[PDB]
Amino acid sequence: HHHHFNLPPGNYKKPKLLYCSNGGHFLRILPDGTVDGTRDRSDQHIQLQLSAESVGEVYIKSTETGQYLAMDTDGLLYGSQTPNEECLFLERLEENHYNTYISKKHAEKNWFVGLNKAGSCKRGPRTHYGQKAILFLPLPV
């Protein structure tokens, strides 16, 4: 393992909103495959359904479009039509409270799902442990 194994509580029974306190944005996967953040709680592309593939390993999928969140070879988040190796994330508890998501494919490089204060997704290499951008709270839809 390249990472700890503290896991968050809660489950995958219902869909969630992934909220980032860094800039106050919800993770959003747009129909065209774009991924960013929005403060609009009424947005129809921020409802996500997570599922466990192995303990602590998840897919994060758009309930509206069916796309899977994925991180590419250059660290950019995108929406994928089909599940592939770039769509698996290591979901962990962080600061004894939040959820973080590390790219399984690039776990040895510590590339996280993260939103900057401007509401844009961060590129993998620009993320790292200790940032506020990588901290999410799963909220009810």
Question: What domains are defined for the chain?
Answer: 1-141 (2.80.10.50)
How were these coordinates obtained?
X-ray
- Which residue, 58, 31, 56, 24, is CA-closest to 45? 31
Whole-Å CA distances, 117 to 21, 33, 136: 9, 21, 13
Which residues share a beta bridge with 49?
A: 61
> What amino acid is encoded at 94 in this protein?
E
Other Cβ atoms less than 10 A from the Cβ of 84: the count is 11
Question: Residue 107 gets which letter from DSSP?
Answer: G
**Residue 19 and residue 17: Cα distance in Å, rounded?**
6
Q: Do the annotations mark residue 22 as ligand-binding?
A: yes
